[PDB]
Amino acid sequence: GISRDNWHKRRKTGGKRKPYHKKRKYELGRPAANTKIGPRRIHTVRVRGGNKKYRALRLDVGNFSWGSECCTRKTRIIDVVYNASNNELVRTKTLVKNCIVLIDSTPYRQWYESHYALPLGRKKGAKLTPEEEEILNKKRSKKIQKKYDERKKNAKISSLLEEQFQQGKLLACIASRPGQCGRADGYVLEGKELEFYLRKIKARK
Amino acid sequence: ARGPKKHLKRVAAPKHWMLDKLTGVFAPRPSTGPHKLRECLPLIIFLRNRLKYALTGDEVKKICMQRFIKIDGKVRTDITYPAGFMDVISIDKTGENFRLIYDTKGRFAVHRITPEEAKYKLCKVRKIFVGTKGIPHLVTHDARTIRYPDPLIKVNDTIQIDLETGKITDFIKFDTGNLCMVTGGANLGRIGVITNRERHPGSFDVVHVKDANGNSFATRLSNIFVIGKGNKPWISLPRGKGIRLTIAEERDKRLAAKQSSG
């Protein structure tokens, strides 16, 4: 019986309307299904026209895109850190649109070394397992080492991202609506937006 | 209402069907189809009210259910099927072919055409879009979509369909100097030559048409159907040539038809 009608509101002058018709079905609202972080649990809503909606009630994974590199990978979701609308959607860890979220970085790390042949997020102890040595220090052809070193002239990240790759957790912002399509998708925060949300998280805590 | 309506009262039926008051409470209520229900002839009205082949709706059911009526080359057993502007109604058993063309008073005439003419029709292109791997599309005024038209065909042009294949043979462009029929409004059923088109952005354009006797009239752009190129129509025209007589000269013609006949 949640409704979205205009006729229960005051007029612009401030006088109250009398209702002339009672609640219709096309003016209905549904409960505000709050997504959490957990193993995947998605319910299905039958909507107007016979179409279909997806209430994600629990998500743990969704794909986020590195905007500068154009690298989109499916990635585990760690934690919610900042919600720009309410602060109580953070202590409850609710996933909605435009919320700031901590994601994994290892699908972006494995793409970065496979494409640019540089270490990223490695410690100064430099303990390297023999798995990634044969992709970081492979034997390769002259024409192919030419291409791999021609890529290395621009393979430079901001310092604000590499300290996140040090901890294995990038910062991302959800761009889709998880109550309406059952997915948590988005993009990795970079640049002015990144330092904006960094000082917001800094001032909030 | 709680949903779509299925009846039509007889007084609220379109005026050009020329139904009368006392034979019933209801009108035939056209089915959904290629033409709008304010702009169509249902097949039951054409077959007993115009052609007088039937005397009831039951006899129209009996005539149509013998698969004797082809509208645009396909058999229609629906008795309220909306036939419309420039559809070819072809009855094979009697050897007749008809095309629905407005009279000078804005009603569909019983226009008989030769079976040479009954293999084509003209359509007005209403929408062009490119869809799903760059295939261009048409949408005509009777809900046909055509893949891969000629790239010179633009919106408001008039193309020619072959009724068996469904493909374009040729087309007319929208330009001043071509011939029209008005398919809407006060000027409905009149025929003349385009002389002008004034473009008002954000609203409807106005097209000025000149009659064969020098009369001139405007319509909107959506009420314009390009018949022919220059002065030659690509179809046969009805009894009046799209020249609306005034009531005085119509009275004079009707009186001159009595002092000579008899």
């Binding site: 612009k12 590199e69 621009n154 970079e190 640049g191 002015k192 937006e193 904006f196 949300y197 | -």
Partner: protein
């Protein structure tokens, strides 16, 4: 500062602004490319629109609205809300029995883009119909002409 006053990061949604680049452009000239469009009814986009730095999602020139419907005009009376003003439209209504007229008026809350700075009261705005932007706001300021005395 000077844009980011809200709790969420304001940006034009159509312009990507984290395109990586080499230091000869990363240090040389720093300019966010601005999105703007041309509304279609002969109205020309102001200079402050295409070069400004404000972020308004309801602006007719740099935001996501379309202008379609009725072109009207009123006179500014109240400038007291955030990015939206109140205009007054005066007209004469014909009473038929007396063959005469009476002065009526109607108010309109209308959205004012930040590209029209130096808008006083008493001057004539041209408004264009858009989609409903608020509970009572349906129009959008398209052109400002000054009052009679402001030289």
């Amino acid at each position: 500062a000077d844009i980011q006053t809200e709790r969420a990061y304001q940006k034009q949604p159509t312009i990507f602004q984290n395109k990586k680049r080499v230091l000869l452009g990363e240090t040389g000239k720093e300019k966010l490319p601005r999105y703007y469009k041309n509304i279609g009814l002969g109205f020309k986009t102001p200079k402050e629109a295409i070069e400004g730095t404000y972020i308004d999602k309801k602006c007719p020139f740099t935001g996501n609205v379309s202008i379609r419907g009725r072109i009207l005009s009123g006179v500014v009376t109240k400038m007291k809300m955030q990015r939206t003003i109140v205009i007054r439209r005066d007209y004469l209504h014909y009473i038929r029995k007396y063959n005469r007229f009476e002065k009526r008026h109607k108010n309109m809350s209308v959205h004012l883009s930040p590209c029209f700075r130096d808008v006083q009261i008493g001057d004539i705005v041209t408004v264009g119909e858009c989609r409903p932007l608020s509970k009572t706001v349906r129009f959008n300021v398209l052109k400002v002409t000054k009052a009679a005395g402001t030289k």
